[PDB]
From a paper:
The NanH sialidase of Tannerella forsythia, one of the bacteria associated with severe periodontal disease plays a role in virulence.
While we were unable to identify DANA in any crystal models, we could solve a model at 1.9 Å with Oseltamivir in the active site after soaking it into the NanH-apo crystals at a concentration of 5 mM. In this model, Oseltamivir is orientated in the active site via its negatively charged carboxyl group, which is held equatorial to the cyclohexene ring through hydrogen bonding interactions with the guanidiniums of the arginine triad. Comparison of the active site conformation between the NanH-apo and oseltamivir bound form shows that all residues have identical conformations except for the sidechain of W308 which is displaced by the pentyl ether group of oseltamivir, with an average displacement for the aromatic rings of the tryptophan of 1.4 Å. The oseltamivir-dependent distortion may be attributed to its competitive inhibitory mechanism where it binds into the active site, but also suggests this region may be a target for the introduction of further modifications of oseltamivir in the design of a new inhibitor molecule.
Residue numbers in the entry:
A (entry chain B), B (entry chain A): 34 to 552
Write the structure that this text describes.
C-alpha cells in the first residue's frame, strides 16, 4: 500500500563501514508481506567510483507504545559504543542484500516475511577510504515492490548528502570519549584539531582528561595519529583522575606560525565537577589553573606547560578558564583567546585575554556581559573585536563589540536576536576579502541551530559584519542529536573546515565550499 | 589529631587483584603531612597463608562540595568497567607500599605529602586464587603515624570479612553486563547458576539478551566456562536485539535430577521495555513467550526451547513470565515455578505454576495478591506452599500460603510486616531437618535488607516456618550498592550458597555455614 522514506541530513563518514543513506518505515504490513525489490537512483553527476558498497538491512519492528512516525527502533550505527563505532550493530540490523559495484540504478532484494504493522529497513552506503571530502551523493528510492506490486513511496528524501571523516571515535586509543573541539589552519595550510581525551567516561573535569591533537597536511583527507598536546599525569603524587586538563582553545600566531593551546588544569577536587567545586585563591590546590603549551614545528611537537594563572586570574574568582574552540591573531599581530570567569558570587562572565608580545605575557580587563560563559572572538573590522557568547538566559547568542581589547564593551545590533541557541558552545571566525574566493569580508558561524537540545549543526555566513545571517547563506550538516560543540577554520581560499561533536563521531571533520554557503 | 577507618562489609573476591580491606579518611591534614606508617593486625586463627598481597593506596582528596563524612572520592574497584573489574582503577589510586608475605602484624609506609584538609588512603587485600570460600579475616588498623606521631584512630572496623568469587564480571566473554541470578544444587552436589547475558548494555528486555549458565563441581571454588542455556539469535529473520530471552528461573527435579530453566522470550518490540510493551494475545509477534530448556546430564548440555505459553497464559494478560531465581520439587514430586502476570488493566499479580508429570504439562490457577510481581516459593510443611512476594506498595514482602497449589490463598502472619524490602527480587528456600547439620526445619531468605535503595544484602534464617526472623539469625554479606537480586541453594548439609548481584561483581557466589546463621 504505502511506504515512508527518510534521507537523513547527516555526514557520510569515509572511514566508516556503514552509513545511514535511507531509513524506511512500512507502517501497516500484513504478516507475510515481503519487500521483494527496492530500486535506488543516483544523480548523473555523482562519482559512483567512490562508493565501495550499498547494503539493505532489516531492523524488525517498533514497540506498541512508541507510535508510528519514527524511522528506526534504535540507533543503527553507534557513535558511543567503544567496541564498534564503524559498522551497524549486528544485533539491531540483519543484512538482506549487498552490491559492491554501484551504477546510477541499483536494485536491492529481500525474502524476509514482515510482521503485522510497522517494519523497518534502511540502506547503508560505504565509501572508499580515499573518497573526496567535497563529493556529494543525490540518492532517491524510486521503486519499492511488496508482493510483486509497486507500493506508494512518500517522504522528504531529496537531501544532497555530504562526506565527512571521523577523526576521533569513542574507544579510539583506549579513550572512552573525546569532547570540546578546537581547529586552526597553520601558515603551511596544516589543519590542527584539539580536544579532551576523556579516558574513564564522558564527564567534565574533574577526571582523567588530557588535551589531544590531530594533524592533517592534506586538507583533512588523512589525519596523523593522536599526539598529547598537554597532560599532568600523577603530578604532586595525586591520581591522574585528580589531575585532568581540558576545554582546550588553540590559535596560530599568524606572524611566526607559533601555535598556542590554552586549557584548564584541575588539581585534586575528588571526582566532582570543577564548574561547582573550583574555589577562590591562586594555587593549584585552591583553584583551576590556566595552562599553555606551544609548537614551533607546525604542531608536530609541543612545549612543556607554563602556568599563566598569576598573570590574569583575580584571586576572588572561583574559576578562570579559556573559552573552548580557538583564538585569533589580529591585523596588528595581537594574539586573542576568549575567556570566562565565575566571580565570588558564582556569576559567570565572558571576556577576552590578549598578548602583544608573541604570547610572552597575557592580560584580561573587563567582562563583556553577565551570565555568559563560552565565547569565540573575531576581528569583524580593523581594531574591532566581536565577542559571540553562550547566554544562560537561553534562546539566542549574546553579541558585544570592543575596540580596546575589553576595557569597554558595546552591545551589537545582533545581540540576543540574530543567532538562536540552546545554551551551547558556538564557533565564529572572520575571513578577509583577499583570503577567500568570494572576494568579500565574511563572518562564519557554527552551532546547533535550535533553542532546544543539540542537533541541526549548521554553518551560517554574514556579508555585513554579523548584522544579518540570511537563511540562504547556511548549510545544514547534522540534523540528529550530538554533544553540539564545533570549531571553524578556513582550509584554503575556497573551503571552510568544521571540527565538531556530531551524531556520527565524537570528533568529526567536514569541508564545505564557500560557494555552497554563498550564491 | 584524629583519623577515621572503615572496614567495609563487602565480599573479598578470590579472583580479584584488589579488594577494599580498609578505607581511611584523614579529615584535617596540614599541607606536607606524611602518613609515615600504618599497622594492621589479623586475629590468631586467620589463615594468612591464603593472603597473596596487601597494598596501601593514595586516592588524593575530596571535592569542596561533598562534605567530610565520606570514606572515598570515587569507587576504587569498578564492577561495571568492561575493560577492568579485577584491579583498582590506576587513574584513581596510586600504590604507596606492598607486602607479599603477611604476618599477624603488618606495617605499610608512604612518603606522599598530603594536601590541606581531606586525604584518602585505602588498604587492598589480594587472596590466593584457591582461597577457601569459607575462610574469614578479622583485621584492625592498630596504629597510624603522621610526622612520627601516632594519631588517634576512630571508626567501626570490627567487621568479620568473608570471601566470595566473581563468577561473572561486566565485560566477560564480550558481554556488557549480567543480571537476574538463579541457583540450584543438583542431586550430584553440582551448583548451577543462571543469569541474563546482556551483550549491548544493562537495560531490560527488549534487547540482545541470552540466558547463560555457570557450573561448579567443587562447591563454587571453580566455575566451568559459560554455557548458553537459552538463545533465540535471529529467529524469523528478526534482529537478535528484538529476540532477547531473560529473567531466568531454574529448578532441579529432585526425583530425576532433570534440571529445568524457564525464561521470557520477547520477539520484536523495537528497543523498548517489555514490561510496558508486551500486549494481550498468544503469538510471539503479540506477547512475551514462556520458554523452557532442560538438562539430563547435570547441566553440561541443554535441550532446544519448548513453548509453554499455550498451556498456562490467559490471552487477555499483557505479560506472563516466571518469577526470576529458582523453583522447587515438593515432597510429592510436584515441580513448582513462581510466576507473575500483568492483567488487561496493567495490574501485576504473583502466583505459582506447577507440573505433576515431570514437567510435561504446566498449570496456573489463581493469583495470590494484587500489585505483586517477583516471588519465590518454598514448601514450609508437607503439601503447604509459602509464596514470598515483591510488593509495589513498598516497605515489606507480601507472604501468602496455599495448600491447593494456588486455587485458594491465605495471608501468612508475617505478611507485610516481618521482612523489609525496597521493592526488589528476594530468594526464599526451605531446608528439611534430616538434610542439614542443625537437625531442624529451616527457611532461608535473602534480599537487600532496606526500605530504600539496594544494599545490605543479607541472609536471614527462621526456625518457626517464617513466623519469626530473629536479628541474631542473619548474616550481612554486602552493605554497598548493587542491583540487589539474589538466589539461595544449600551446597551440602552444613553450608548455604548465595548467587547474587553485588557491589563487587555482576554475578557473585558466597558460601555461609548454617552455624554462622544459627549460633
Ligand atoms: C565551566 C562551566 C561550563 C559552562 C556552563 O561548562 C561546560 C559545559 C559543557 C556542556 O554544556 O556540555 C561541557 C564543557 N566541558 C563544560 N566545561 C567545564 C570546564 O566543565
Ligand atoms: C514485569 C517486569 C519486571 C517485574 C516487575 O521488572 C523487572 C525489574 C527489574 C529490577 O527491578 O531490577 C529487573 C528485571 N529484569 C525486570 N524484568 C523485566 C522483564 O523487565
Amino acid at each position: 500500500d504505502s511506504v515512508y522514506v527518510q534521507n537523513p541530513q547527516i555526514p557520510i563518514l569515509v572511514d566508516r563501514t556503514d552509513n545511514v543513506l535511507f531509513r524506511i518505515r512500512i507502517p501497516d504490513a500484513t504478516k507475510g508481506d515481503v519487500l521483494n525489490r527496492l530500486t535506488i537512483r543516483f544523480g548523473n553527476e555523482d562519482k559512483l567510483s567512490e562508493v565501495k558498497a550499498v547494503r539493505l538491512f532489516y531492523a524488525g519492528t517498533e514497540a506498541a507504545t512508541k507510535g508510528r512516525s519514527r524511522f528506526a527502533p534504535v540507533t543503527y550505527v553507534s557513535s558511543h559504543n567503544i567496541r564498534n563505532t564503524r559498522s551497524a550493530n549486528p544485533s539491531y540490523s540483519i543484512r538482506q542484500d549487498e552490491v559492491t559495484t554501484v551504477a546510477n540504478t541499483l536494485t536491492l532484494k529481500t525474502r524476509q516475511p514482515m510482521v503485522k504493522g510497522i517494519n523497518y529497513f534502511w540502506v547503508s552506503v560505504e565509501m572508499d577510504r580515499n573518497t573526496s571530502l567535497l563529493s556529494k551523493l543525490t540518492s532517491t528510492v524510486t521503486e519499492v515492490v511488496i508482493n510483486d506490486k509497486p507500493a506508494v513511496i512518500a517522504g522528504e528524501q531529496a537531501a544532497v548528502r555530504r562526506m565527512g571523516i571521523g577523526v576521533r571515535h569513542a574507544g579510539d586509543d583506549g579513550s572512552a570519549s573525546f569532547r570540546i573541539p578546537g581547529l586552526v589552519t597553520t601558515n603551511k595550510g596544516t589543519l590542527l584539531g584539539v580536544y579532551d581525551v576523556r579516558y574513564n567516561n564522558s564527564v567534565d573535569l574533574q577526571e582523567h582528561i588530557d588535551v589531544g591533537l590531530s594533524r592533517s597536511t592534506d586538507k583533512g583527507q588523512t589525519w596523523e595519529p593522536m599526539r598529547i598536546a598537554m597532560s599532568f599525569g600523577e603530578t604532586d603524587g595525586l591520581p591522574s583522575g585528580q589531575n585532568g586538563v581540558g576545554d582546550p582553545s588553540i590559535l596560530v600566531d599568524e606572524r611566526t606560525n607559533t601555535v598556542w593551546v590554552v586549557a584548564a588544569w584541575t588539581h585534586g577536587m575528588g571526582n566532582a565537577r570543577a564548574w561547582t567545586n573550583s574555589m577562590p585563591g591562586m594555587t593549584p590546590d585552591e583553584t583551576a589553573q590556566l595552562m599553555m603549551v606551544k609548537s614551533t614545528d607546525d604542531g608536530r611537537t609541543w612545549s612543556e606547560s607554563t602556568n599563566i594563572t598569576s598573570q590574569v586570574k583575580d584571586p576572588s574568582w572561583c574559576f578562570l578558564l579559556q573559552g573552548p574552540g580557538r583564538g585569533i591573531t589580529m591585523r596588528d599581530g595581537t594574539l586573542v583567546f576568549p575567556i570566562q570567569f565565575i566571580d565570588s558570587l558564582r556569576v559567570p562572565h565572558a571576556g577576552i585575554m590578549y598578548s602583544k608580545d608573541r604570547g610572552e605575557t597575557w592580560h584580561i580587563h573587563q567582562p563583556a556581559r553577565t551570565n555568559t560563559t563560552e565565547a569565540q572572538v573575531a576581528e569583524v573590522e580593523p581594531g574591532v573585536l566581536m565577542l559571540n557568547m553562550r547566554d544562560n538566559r537561553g534562546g539566542s547568542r549574546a553579541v558585544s563589540i570592543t575596540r580596546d581589547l575589553g576595557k569597554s564593551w558595546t552591545e551589537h545590533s545582533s545581540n540576543r536576536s540574530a543567532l538562536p541557541e540552546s545554551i551551547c558552545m558556538a564557533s565564529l571566525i572572520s575571513v578577509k576579502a583577499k583570503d577567500n574566493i568570494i572576494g568579500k569580508d565574511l563572518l562564519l558561524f557554527s552551532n546547533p541551530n535550535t533553542t532546544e537540545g543539540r542537533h541541526h549543526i549548521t554553518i551560517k555566513a554574514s556579508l555585513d559584519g554579523g548584522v544579518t545571517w540570511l537563511p540562504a547563506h547556511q548549510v545544514l550538516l547534522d540534523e540528529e542529536d550530538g554533544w553540539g560543540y564545533s570549531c571553524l577554520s578556513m582550509i584554503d581560499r575556497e573551503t571552510v573546515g568544521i571540527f565538531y561533536e556530531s551524531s556520527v563521531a565524537h570528533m568529526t571533520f567536514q569541508a564545505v565550499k564557500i560557494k555552497d554557503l554563498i550564491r
